[PDB]
Amino acid sequence: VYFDLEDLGNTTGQWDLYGSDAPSPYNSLQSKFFETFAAPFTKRGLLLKFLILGGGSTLAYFSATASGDILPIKKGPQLPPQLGPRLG
């Protein structure tokens, strides 16, 4: 029946429509590879700190060491400074 006060998940359509539920198609040794190597990143708070500080310092690095051949803002003006309307 489509209405049952005992099972409301069925009654309210709370299903996994495309969930496979099959076992892993990933073979092991590959799995153990990624399980041992991605393990340090599976602590969400620690990962948040590593991303904010790591990405932040990374940004600071590529910003501090940028070359004028990449950014015109580091290259600076290369022309003789022009003259204002009435002033300098």
């Binding site: 948040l48 904010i52 932040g56 940004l59 600071a60 910003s63 501090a64 940028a66 580091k74």
Partner: peptide, 30 residues
């Protein structure tokens, strides 16, 4: 040199940290 440090600091890092933090405080449940 210093603007190349502080412009991304307050224009990228600070808004990301503040938005993430405020997001957490705003979504918290006691």
């Amino acid at each position: 040199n210093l603007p190349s440090l502080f412009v991304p600091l307050v224009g990228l890092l600070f808004p990301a940290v503040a938005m993430a933090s405020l997001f957490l405080h705003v979504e918290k449940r006691l």
